[PDB]
Short mmCIF file of C-alpha atoms and ligand atoms in Angstrom, two decimals:
data_model
loop_
_atom_site.label_atom_id
_atom_site.label_comp_id
_atom_site.label_asym_id
_atom_site.label_seq_id
_atom_site.Cartn_x
_atom_site.Cartn_y
_atom_site.Cartn_z
CA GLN A 1 8.36 -17.26 22.76
CA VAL A 2 8.62 -13.67 20.43
CA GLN A 3 11.91 -12.26 19.52
CA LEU A 4 10.93 -8.66 18.23
CA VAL A 5 7.70 -6.43 19.63
CA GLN A 6 7.85 -2.79 18.40
CA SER A 7 6.10 0.14 20.27
CA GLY A 8 2.67 1.18 18.97
CA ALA A 9 1.14 4.06 16.28
CA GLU A 10 2.51 6.97 15.96
CA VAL A 11 0.97 10.44 14.57
CA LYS A 12 3.29 13.28 14.18
CA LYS A 13 3.38 16.93 12.47
CA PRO A 14 5.70 17.68 9.90
CA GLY A 15 9.00 18.83 11.70
CA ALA A 16 8.65 16.84 14.12
CA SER A 17 10.72 13.41 15.44
CA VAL A 18 9.19 9.89 16.15
CA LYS A 19 10.95 7.93 18.22
CA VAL A 20 10.37 3.41 17.43
CA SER A 21 10.80 1.37 20.16
CA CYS A 22 11.83 -2.50 18.98
CA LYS A 23 12.30 -4.78 22.29
CA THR A 24 14.27 -8.31 21.92
CA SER A 25 14.64 -11.67 23.41
CA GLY A 26 18.18 -11.88 24.95
CA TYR A 27 18.99 -14.24 22.52
CA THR A 28 18.67 -11.66 19.91
CA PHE A 29 20.05 -8.86 21.77
CA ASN A 30 23.35 -10.65 22.10
CA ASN A 31 23.90 -12.39 19.02
CA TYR A 32 21.57 -10.70 15.56
CA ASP A 33 21.80 -7.09 13.99
CA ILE A 34 18.98 -4.77 14.28
CA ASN A 35 17.62 -3.90 10.61
CA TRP A 36 15.25 -1.03 10.19
CA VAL A 37 13.50 -1.27 7.54
CA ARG A 38 10.45 0.73 6.10
CA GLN A 39 7.62 0.62 4.04
CA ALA A 40 4.66 3.07 2.87
CA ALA A 41 1.58 1.86 1.67
CA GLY A 42 1.62 0.12 -2.20
CA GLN A 43 5.33 0.33 -2.18
CA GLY A 44 8.47 -1.27 -1.54
CA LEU A 45 11.01 -2.39 1.47
CA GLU A 46 13.42 0.83 2.04
CA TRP A 47 16.37 -0.01 4.05
CA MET A 48 17.39 2.77 6.71
CA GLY A 49 20.23 1.23 8.48
CA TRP A 50 21.38 -1.21 11.59
CA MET A 51 22.46 -1.13 14.73
CA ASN A 52 24.37 -4.21 16.44
CA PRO A 53 22.86 -4.00 19.98
CA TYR A 54 25.43 -6.47 21.87
CA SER A 55 28.60 -3.51 20.88
CA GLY A 56 26.29 -0.71 19.85
CA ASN A 57 27.63 0.18 16.39
CA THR A 58 25.41 1.29 13.89
CA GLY A 59 25.24 1.99 10.08
CA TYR A 60 22.90 4.14 8.42
CA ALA A 61 22.13 4.61 4.58
CA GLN A 62 22.76 8.08 2.72
CA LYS A 63 19.64 9.15 2.21
CA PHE A 64 19.07 9.74 6.09
CA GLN A 65 22.12 11.09 7.33
CA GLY A 66 21.52 13.14 10.09
CA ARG A 67 18.11 12.59 10.24
CA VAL A 68 18.01 9.18 11.76
CA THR A 69 19.41 8.67 15.28
CA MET A 70 19.44 4.18 16.56
CA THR A 71 20.16 3.87 20.26
CA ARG A 72 19.49 0.85 22.62
CA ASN A 73 18.61 -0.26 26.59
CA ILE A 74 21.11 -2.79 27.62
CA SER A 75 18.99 -3.14 30.80
CA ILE A 76 15.57 -3.94 29.22
CA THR A 77 17.39 -5.62 25.98
CA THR A 78 15.63 -2.52 23.46
CA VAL A 79 16.48 -0.76 20.57
CA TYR A 80 15.38 2.06 19.31
CA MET A 81 15.02 4.68 15.91
CA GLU A 82 14.19 7.80 15.56
CA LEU A 83 13.58 9.79 12.74
CA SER A 84 13.57 13.37 12.82
CA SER A 85 12.56 16.35 10.31
CA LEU A 86 9.65 13.74 9.50
CA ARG A 87 7.30 15.03 6.33
CA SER A 88 4.77 13.80 5.07
CA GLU A 89 6.64 11.20 2.52
CA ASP A 90 7.59 9.78 6.00
CA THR A 91 3.91 8.24 6.80
CA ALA A 92 4.82 4.99 6.45
CA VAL A 93 5.28 1.39 8.61
CA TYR A 94 8.11 0.98 10.13
CA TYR A 95 9.77 -2.62 11.03
CA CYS A 96 12.68 -4.09 12.90
CA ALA A 97 14.23 -6.97 11.51
CA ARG A 98 17.22 -9.49 12.89
CA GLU A 99 19.91 -10.94 10.95
CA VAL A 100 23.28 -12.79 11.73
CA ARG A 101 26.17 -11.10 10.42
CA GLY A 102 29.68 -12.19 2.00
CA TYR A 103 28.31 -12.56 5.51
CA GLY A 104 24.46 -12.28 5.65
CA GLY A 105 21.99 -14.29 6.24
CA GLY A 106 19.33 -11.97 6.10
CA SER A 107 16.34 -11.00 8.40
CA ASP A 108 14.40 -13.68 8.96
CA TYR A 109 12.53 -12.76 12.47
CA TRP A 110 10.36 -9.56 11.76
CA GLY A 111 8.65 -7.04 14.42
CA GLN A 112 4.71 -6.29 13.88
CA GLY A 113 5.74 -2.87 12.04
CA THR A 114 4.65 0.82 13.48
CA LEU A 115 2.85 3.06 11.40
CA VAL A 116 4.04 6.45 11.51
CA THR A 117 1.70 9.05 10.44
CA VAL A 118 3.09 12.00 9.63
CA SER A 119 0.38 15.12 9.20
CA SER A 120 -0.39 18.47 10.13
CA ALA A 121 -4.19 18.29 10.06
CA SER A 122 -6.02 18.54 13.67
CA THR A 123 -8.95 16.39 14.02
CA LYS A 124 -11.56 17.07 11.25
CA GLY A 125 -14.86 15.52 10.39
CA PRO A 126 -15.50 14.94 6.32
CA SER A 127 -17.35 16.06 3.76
CA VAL A 128 -19.67 13.83 1.35
CA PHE A 129 -20.36 13.82 -1.51
CA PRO A 130 -22.85 12.38 -3.96
CA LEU A 131 -21.72 10.16 -6.24
CA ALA A 132 -24.25 10.12 -8.59
CA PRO A 133 -25.69 7.41 -11.18
CA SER A 134 -25.49 8.62 -14.81
CA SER A 135 -25.16 6.90 -18.26
CA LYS A 136 -21.04 7.16 -17.50
CA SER A 137 -21.93 5.09 -14.38
CA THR A 138 -24.29 2.60 -16.22
CA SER A 139 -23.30 -0.42 -17.47
CA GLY A 140 -26.09 -2.67 -18.98
CA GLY A 141 -28.82 -3.27 -16.43
CA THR A 142 -25.83 -1.97 -13.28
CA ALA A 143 -26.02 1.24 -12.27
CA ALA A 144 -22.81 2.09 -9.89
CA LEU A 145 -23.49 5.35 -6.97
CA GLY A 146 -21.84 6.36 -4.42
CA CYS A 147 -20.62 9.00 -1.44
CA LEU A 148 -17.15 10.39 -1.84
CA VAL A 149 -15.90 10.84 2.01
CA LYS A 150 -13.55 13.90 2.16
CA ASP A 151 -11.42 14.97 3.55
CA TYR A 152 -11.37 13.85 7.43
CA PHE A 153 -8.43 13.22 10.60
CA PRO A 154 -7.70 10.97 12.05
CA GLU A 155 -8.86 7.48 10.80
CA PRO A 156 -11.38 5.75 11.21
CA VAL A 157 -14.60 5.99 9.70
CA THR A 158 -17.06 3.68 8.58
CA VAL A 159 -20.03 4.32 6.07
CA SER A 160 -23.12 2.03 5.43
CA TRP A 161 -26.09 2.59 2.95
CA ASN A 162 -29.96 2.73 4.02
CA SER A 163 -29.09 2.68 7.84
CA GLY A 164 -27.78 -1.28 6.97
CA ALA A 165 -30.66 -2.40 4.58
CA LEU A 166 -28.41 -2.29 1.34
CA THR A 167 -25.36 -4.56 1.79
CA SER A 168 -25.28 -6.64 -1.47
CA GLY A 169 -22.93 -5.13 -4.07
CA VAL A 170 -21.78 -1.79 -1.61
CA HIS A 171 -17.34 -1.70 -2.16
CA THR A 172 -16.33 0.94 0.82
CA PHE A 173 -12.95 1.48 0.14
CA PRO A 174 -9.93 1.64 2.36
CA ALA A 175 -8.77 5.46 2.59
CA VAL A 176 -5.90 6.94 1.71
CA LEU A 177 -4.20 10.15 3.15
CA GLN A 178 -4.07 12.98 0.33
CA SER A 179 -1.19 15.66 0.57
CA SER A 180 -3.16 17.83 2.38
CA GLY A 181 -2.74 15.72 5.49
CA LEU A 182 -6.42 14.70 4.94
CA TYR A 183 -7.76 11.33 4.16
CA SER A 184 -10.18 10.49 1.82
CA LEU A 185 -12.03 7.89 0.77
CA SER A 186 -15.32 6.05 -1.28
CA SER A 187 -18.26 3.60 -0.51
CA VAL A 188 -20.24 2.64 -3.62
CA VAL A 189 -22.65 0.01 -4.41
CA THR A 190 -23.88 -1.52 -7.70
CA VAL A 191 -27.96 -1.58 -7.78
CA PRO A 192 -30.56 -2.48 -11.15
CA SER A 193 -30.86 0.46 -13.23
CA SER A 194 -34.37 0.12 -13.25
CA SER A 195 -34.55 0.80 -9.46
CA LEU A 196 -32.99 4.36 -10.20
CA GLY A 197 -36.53 6.09 -10.08
CA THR A 198 -37.99 4.63 -7.45
CA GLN A 199 -35.63 3.83 -4.77
CA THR A 200 -34.05 5.90 -2.69
CA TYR A 201 -30.20 5.39 -1.58
CA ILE A 202 -28.70 7.23 1.19
CA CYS A 203 -24.98 6.28 2.80
CA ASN A 204 -24.45 6.89 6.58
CA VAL A 205 -21.44 8.05 7.66
CA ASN A 206 -19.69 8.14 10.78
CA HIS A 207 -16.67 9.67 11.20
CA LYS A 208 -16.80 9.27 15.82
CA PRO A 209 -13.53 11.08 16.05
CA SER A 210 -14.50 14.36 15.01
CA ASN A 211 -17.95 13.09 16.42
CA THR A 212 -19.74 14.11 12.72
CA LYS A 213 -22.27 11.88 11.23
CA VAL A 214 -24.13 12.45 8.13
CA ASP A 215 -27.05 11.23 5.68
CA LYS A 216 -26.13 12.01 1.87
CA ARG A 217 -29.20 11.35 -0.66
CA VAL A 218 -27.69 9.84 -3.56
CA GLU A 219 -30.23 10.24 -6.49
CA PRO A 220 -29.47 10.31 -10.48
CA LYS A 221 -28.02 13.18 -12.49
CA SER A 222 -30.40 14.92 -14.49
CA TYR B 1 22.73 0.84 -6.68
CA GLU B 2 19.62 -0.63 -7.45
CA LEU B 3 17.95 -3.47 -8.04
CA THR B 4 15.81 -4.72 -10.57
CA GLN B 5 12.89 -7.07 -10.84
CA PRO B 6 9.83 -7.63 -12.94
CA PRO B 7 6.37 -5.47 -11.54
CA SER B 8 4.61 -8.80 -11.45
CA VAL B 9 4.73 -12.15 -12.95
CA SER B 10 1.40 -14.31 -13.71
CA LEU B 11 0.98 -18.29 -14.30
CA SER B 12 -1.09 -20.87 -13.56
CA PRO B 13 -0.80 -23.45 -10.40
CA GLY B 14 1.76 -26.57 -10.87
CA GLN B 15 3.54 -24.26 -13.37
CA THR B 16 6.96 -22.84 -12.27
CA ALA B 17 6.95 -19.18 -11.50
CA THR B 18 10.81 -17.59 -12.49
CA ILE B 19 11.41 -14.11 -10.62
CA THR B 20 14.34 -12.40 -12.22
CA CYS B 21 16.73 -9.43 -9.98
CA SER B 22 19.57 -7.85 -11.87
CA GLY B 23 22.70 -5.32 -10.66
CA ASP B 24 26.10 -4.39 -11.40
CA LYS B 25 27.31 -5.67 -8.10
CA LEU B 26 25.75 -8.61 -7.47
CA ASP B 27 27.75 -11.69 -8.34
CA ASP B 28 29.89 -9.90 -5.50
CA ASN B 29 27.23 -9.92 -2.90
CA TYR B 30 25.29 -12.72 -1.77
CA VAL B 31 21.01 -12.16 -2.75
CA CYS B 32 18.11 -12.82 0.04
CA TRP B 33 14.42 -13.48 -0.77
CA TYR B 34 11.54 -12.40 1.03
CA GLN B 35 7.61 -12.80 0.68
CA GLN B 36 5.00 -10.54 2.03
CA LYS B 37 1.47 -11.33 2.06
CA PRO B 38 -1.17 -8.42 2.71
CA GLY B 39 -1.16 -6.90 5.56
CA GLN B 40 1.97 -9.18 6.96
CA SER B 41 5.39 -8.71 7.92
CA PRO B 42 8.29 -9.91 5.60
CA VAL B 43 9.02 -13.58 5.69
CA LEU B 44 12.57 -14.64 4.64
CA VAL B 45 12.75 -17.72 1.75
CA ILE B 46 16.25 -17.72 0.03
CA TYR B 47 19.56 -16.37 1.70
CA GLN B 48 22.72 -16.59 0.59
CA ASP B 49 21.65 -17.12 -3.05
CA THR B 50 20.49 -20.32 -2.78
CA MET B 51 20.00 -21.21 0.85
CA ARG B 52 16.24 -22.14 2.36
CA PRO B 53 15.63 -21.26 5.62
CA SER B 54 14.44 -24.06 8.09
CA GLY B 55 10.83 -23.85 7.62
CA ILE B 56 10.70 -22.95 3.81
CA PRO B 57 9.14 -25.40 1.50
CA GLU B 58 11.48 -26.97 -1.05
CA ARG B 59 10.11 -25.90 -3.87
CA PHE B 60 11.49 -22.84 -3.05
CA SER B 61 15.19 -22.04 -4.85
CA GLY B 62 17.36 -19.56 -5.70
CA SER B 63 20.73 -18.64 -8.19
CA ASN B 64 22.57 -15.82 -8.23
CA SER B 65 25.30 -15.78 -11.53
CA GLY B 66 25.88 -13.11 -14.40
CA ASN B 67 24.77 -10.09 -12.40
CA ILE B 68 21.25 -12.02 -12.65
CA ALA B 69 20.04 -13.60 -8.89
CA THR B 70 16.17 -15.96 -10.26
CA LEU B 71 13.67 -16.80 -7.11
CA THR B 72 11.87 -19.69 -8.30
CA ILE B 73 8.97 -21.81 -7.67
CA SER B 74 8.05 -25.19 -8.64
CA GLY B 75 4.46 -26.26 -8.53
CA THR B 76 3.17 -22.99 -7.52
CA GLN B 77 0.00 -23.00 -5.70
CA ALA B 78 -2.12 -20.33 -4.08
CA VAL B 79 -0.68 -19.87 -1.11
CA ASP B 80 2.46 -18.50 -2.96
CA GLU B 81 0.74 -15.34 -4.41
CA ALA B 82 2.29 -12.51 -2.55
CA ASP B 83 4.89 -10.17 -3.43
CA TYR B 84 8.55 -11.05 -3.72
CA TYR B 85 11.89 -8.94 -2.73
CA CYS B 86 15.39 -9.20 -3.81
CA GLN B 87 17.95 -7.69 -1.32
CA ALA B 88 21.29 -7.36 -1.19
CA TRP B 89 24.38 -5.55 0.20
CA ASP B 90 26.78 -3.61 -1.77
CA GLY B 91 29.44 -2.54 0.56
CA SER B 92 27.16 -1.79 3.35
CA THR B 93 24.14 -0.31 2.84
CA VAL B 94 21.21 -2.87 1.73
CA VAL B 95 19.73 -2.48 -1.54
CA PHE B 96 16.02 -3.84 -1.91
CA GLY B 97 14.08 -4.64 -4.88
CA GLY B 98 10.99 -2.90 -6.34
CA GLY B 99 9.81 -6.16 -5.28
CA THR B 100 7.19 -8.77 -7.80
CA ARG B 101 3.71 -9.41 -7.88
CA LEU B 102 3.48 -13.40 -8.41
CA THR B 103 -0.12 -13.73 -9.40
CA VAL B 104 -1.54 -17.58 -9.39
CA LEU B 105 -4.47 -17.33 -11.86
CA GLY B 106 -6.69 -19.62 -9.67
CA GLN B 107 -9.93 -19.22 -11.94
CA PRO B 108 -11.19 -17.08 -15.60
CA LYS B 109 -10.36 -13.66 -15.62
CA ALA B 110 -12.81 -11.38 -15.23
CA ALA B 111 -12.48 -7.56 -16.87
CA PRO B 112 -13.71 -4.53 -14.80
CA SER B 113 -16.48 -2.83 -14.71
CA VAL B 114 -15.50 0.85 -15.36
CA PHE B 115 -17.82 3.55 -14.14
CA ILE B 116 -16.73 7.21 -13.71
CA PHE B 117 -18.72 10.06 -11.77
CA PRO B 118 -17.66 13.75 -12.46
CA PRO B 119 -17.21 15.91 -9.34
CA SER B 120 -20.67 17.13 -7.45
CA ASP B 121 -22.02 21.07 -7.95
CA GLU B 122 -21.84 20.83 -4.12
CA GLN B 123 -18.08 19.37 -4.02
CA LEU B 124 -17.30 22.74 -6.85
CA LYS B 125 -18.70 24.72 -4.47
CA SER B 126 -16.03 24.29 -2.03
CA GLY B 127 -13.22 24.85 -4.94
CA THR B 128 -12.17 21.55 -5.44
CA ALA B 129 -12.91 18.88 -8.29
CA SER B 130 -12.76 14.70 -7.32
CA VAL B 131 -13.20 12.96 -10.16
CA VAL B 132 -13.68 9.12 -9.33
CA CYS B 133 -13.02 5.99 -11.65
CA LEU B 134 -14.05 2.75 -10.78
CA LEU B 135 -13.20 -0.81 -11.47
CA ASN B 136 -15.97 -3.11 -10.53
CA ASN B 137 -15.65 -6.69 -9.59
CA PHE B 138 -12.60 -7.93 -11.95
CA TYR B 139 -9.81 -11.17 -11.76
CA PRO B 140 -7.00 -11.30 -10.96
CA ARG B 141 -5.84 -8.25 -9.09
CA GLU B 142 -3.39 -6.31 -10.84
CA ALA B 143 -4.80 -3.46 -12.66
CA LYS B 144 -3.81 0.12 -14.31
CA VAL B 145 -4.94 3.26 -14.31
CA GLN B 146 -4.30 6.47 -15.76
CA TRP B 147 -5.66 9.71 -15.94
CA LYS B 148 -5.97 11.85 -18.91
CA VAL B 149 -7.16 15.58 -18.86
CA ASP B 150 -7.98 16.83 -22.83
CA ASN B 151 -5.46 13.98 -23.83
CA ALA B 152 -2.48 14.93 -21.34
CA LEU B 153 -1.55 12.39 -19.03
CA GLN B 154 -1.63 13.22 -15.53
CA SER B 155 0.95 12.60 -12.89
CA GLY B 156 1.23 13.47 -8.95
CA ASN B 157 -2.85 14.09 -8.53
CA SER B 158 -4.48 10.80 -8.52
CA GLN B 159 -4.40 7.81 -5.59
CA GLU B 160 -6.12 4.60 -5.56
CA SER B 161 -7.65 2.25 -3.37
CA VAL B 162 -8.25 -1.55 -4.03
CA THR B 163 -10.88 -3.78 -1.71
CA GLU B 164 -9.66 -7.15 0.08
CA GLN B 165 -10.62 -10.04 -2.53
CA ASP B 166 -14.33 -10.95 -2.07
CA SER B 167 -14.41 -14.32 0.16
CA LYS B 168 -16.97 -16.23 -3.01
CA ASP B 169 -15.86 -15.16 -6.38
CA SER B 170 -12.67 -14.37 -5.21
CA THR B 171 -12.94 -10.75 -7.58
CA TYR B 172 -11.37 -7.31 -6.08
CA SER B 173 -12.88 -3.64 -7.13
CA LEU B 174 -10.74 -0.46 -6.88
CA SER B 175 -10.90 3.86 -7.04
CA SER B 176 -9.41 5.57 -8.24
CA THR B 177 -9.59 9.41 -7.63
CA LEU B 178 -7.90 12.82 -9.27
CA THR B 179 -8.63 15.41 -7.75
CA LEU B 180 -7.72 19.06 -8.89
CA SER B 181 -8.33 22.06 -8.22
CA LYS B 182 -12.28 24.24 -9.18
CA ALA B 183 -10.06 26.51 -11.06
CA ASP B 184 -7.72 23.46 -13.34
CA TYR B 185 -10.94 21.42 -13.50
CA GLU B 186 -12.53 23.99 -15.46
CA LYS B 187 -9.81 25.33 -17.92
CA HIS B 188 -10.59 21.39 -19.71
CA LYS B 189 -13.04 19.51 -21.14
CA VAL B 190 -12.16 16.04 -21.89
CA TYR B 191 -11.64 13.59 -18.63
CA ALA B 192 -10.45 9.76 -19.20
CA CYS B 193 -9.26 7.35 -16.68
CA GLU B 194 -7.35 4.31 -19.22
CA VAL B 195 -7.91 1.35 -17.90
CA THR B 196 -5.74 -1.72 -18.37
CA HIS B 197 -6.21 -5.48 -17.45
CA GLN B 198 -5.60 -8.82 -17.95
CA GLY B 199 -8.89 -9.75 -18.98
CA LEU B 200 -9.22 -7.12 -21.28
CA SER B 201 -7.59 -7.37 -24.95
CA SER B 202 -6.94 -3.20 -25.23
CA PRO B 203 -7.02 -0.61 -22.82
CA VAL B 204 -10.69 0.66 -21.75
CA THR B 205 -11.41 4.28 -21.74
CA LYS B 206 -14.49 5.94 -19.97
CA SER B 207 -14.12 9.61 -19.98
CA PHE B 208 -17.34 12.16 -20.27
CA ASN B 209 -17.17 16.08 -21.31
CA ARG B 210 -17.74 18.38 -18.35
CA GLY B 211 -20.97 19.57 -18.45
CA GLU B 212 -23.06 16.54 -20.56
CA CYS B 213 -26.51 16.98 -19.29
C1 LIG C 301 17.06 1.83 30.50
O1 LIG C 301 15.28 1.81 30.81
C2 LIG C 301 15.71 2.14 32.51
C3 LIG C 301 13.97 1.37 32.54
O2 LIG C 301 12.63 1.43 32.04
C4 LIG C 301 15.72 3.26 33.19
O3 LIG C 301 15.66 3.22 34.45
C5 LIG C 301 14.21 4.44 34.52
O4 LIG C 301 14.61 5.21 34.55
C6 LIG C 301 13.52 6.38 34.79
C7 LIG C 301 14.29 7.62 34.94
O5 LIG C 301 15.43 7.48 34.48
C8 LIG C 301 13.01 5.68 35.87
O6 LIG C 301 12.24 6.60 36.61
C9 LIG C 301 11.90 7.42 37.33
O7 LIG C 301 11.25 6.85 38.64
C10 LIG C 301 11.16 8.04 39.69
C11 LIG C 301 10.12 6.72 40.78
O8 LIG C 301 9.13 6.12 40.25
C12 LIG C 301 10.58 9.12 39.46
O9 LIG C 301 10.50 9.55 41.15
C13 LIG C 301 11.54 9.60 38.57
O10 LIG C 301 11.06 11.11 38.27
C14 LIG C 301 11.62 8.80 37.61
O11 LIG C 301 10.20 8.78 36.64
C15 LIG C 301 12.91 4.56 36.57
O12 LIG C 301 12.78 4.16 37.86
C16 LIG C 301 14.12 3.80 35.72
N1 LIG C 301 13.79 1.91 36.07
C17 LIG C 301 14.70 1.06 36.52
C18 LIG C 301 14.29 0.07 36.76
O13 LIG C 301 15.92 1.42 36.58
C19 LIG C 301 17.08 3.57 32.59
O14 LIG C 301 17.65 4.43 32.28
C20 LIG C 301 17.72 3.34 31.19
N2 LIG C 301 18.35 3.63 30.86
C21 LIG C 301 18.90 4.87 29.35
C22 LIG C 301 20.46 4.11 29.37
O15 LIG C 301 18.08 5.11 29.08
#
């Protein structure tokens, strides 16, 4: 039996609030404390606070004073964490995790996490810029080229090359969320340097949320 | 109160991993350790300094003394590659260490191939400049990319992305993108990404001068 299950992904504007749900089993609800812990992309774990669902007692980390609200609903054995006054730096995966409560047994069961994306952005299609092969992207007999898919929202975007005919040596990177609240990613491919004068290279970009479809030819820098 | 972990630990299979975690009030309180693999939730491997939860292999052990907590992994195997976090309580609040990336070298090191891309003229028209540094097909995953503009370190205006491990040769690739305003971009000449990697004896620098053709 699953002991913890969280609500789905959230997108919120700066200044708004987000309420994450964590439904627990009866056993977990009655005998454990629940910790709330968040983690931003490529960063570490950050503890936010705790709640004892049976009693309703709570504690928060000083950094989140006033901004976090932990509540419960006994009838459906669910606990909640609401984070208010959201800012870009609050974009992260938010976890609930149970612990028996020196007298701490650790967080031995974790929810799947809830992604919260904080951005002021409305739906927006990407600009697609060439990453042109040049002497500065040539390592011996291999040349690198690509497409910069910049300033779109929300996820996701897909990229292919030459309408799917070119797959070898292609690396399409996971997107990053910029400080602007828009996503950006790159798709690159390594090819024989000798092919640059004779072979055509086109990246095919589809950002379905904005219905943006772009084919960008990538030519050597002259 | 903060807990200090080594950012990275690299060893060979079968060797014994030692991951430390220091803090003023450690001998006051119990330490727990968590394992986290990419795309997954943390897993508790040690609690109360030395205790293994049920189902955790016996090669994981812990100790805490002299304000230093240590996670030890005997006969380190491939499945042990992960990020490891220590954690304690100071009175009420929980504190996490910064995390230790544990790399188990399963194949020879491969230095990255480094490529640099100036901003396109098309983008410059839009009033922004993106400079992309590509590290291609390297092993192990740990790599550092830093931006220098006219030999001045750049902080706060770059972002990194890494691919998943290649199924076949088990290598990685990484992109670093420096974003400036068009104005700031045009105020400088030398753009460089400095790359360090265990497969490199010394740092490698790929650079260009704004206007090279
Ligand atoms: C704890 O959770 C339970 C169940 O989610 C809450 O009970 C539910 O409360 C809502 C609103 O108070 C009820 O919805 C109402 O339904 C009627 C008919 O469908 C509709 O006309 C109303 O406009 C309203 O939407 C819902 O029926 C009710 N469900 C049950 C099983 O009682 C409860 O309020 C929660 N407790 C706390 C303290 O939050």
